[PDB]
Amino acid sequence: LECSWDELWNKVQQAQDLDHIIAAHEVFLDTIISRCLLDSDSRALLNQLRAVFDQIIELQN
């Protein structure tokens, strides 16, 4: 949220077409989709992330 916010903020603050505003929104969101572990390929990483979340609630008990 500082790199991607800057990228978005540039390609909106210049944008001479409404379409450029639109095609600015699209890519900014999809970059966030990629940086977070939300892809059809990065499932395996997310799976380990859920198990690193499990032991936190386990320790509480």
Binding site: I22, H25, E26, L29, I32
Partner: protein, 61 residues
Amino acid sequence: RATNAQFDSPEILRRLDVRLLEVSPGDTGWDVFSLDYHVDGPIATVFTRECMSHYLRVFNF
């Protein structure tokens, strides 16, 4: 009303309202809550609903 959120625009404050998830009975009380910022105005043309869904997913992470 208590915090600094109060000063901000009534438009966006109006557009922010709660939604809930499905399958509520079996406790899981932490999965049930959500924020949905609803868009229905002229600006829906630039904030499309399929990206609204994506904002909910990133909110959830």
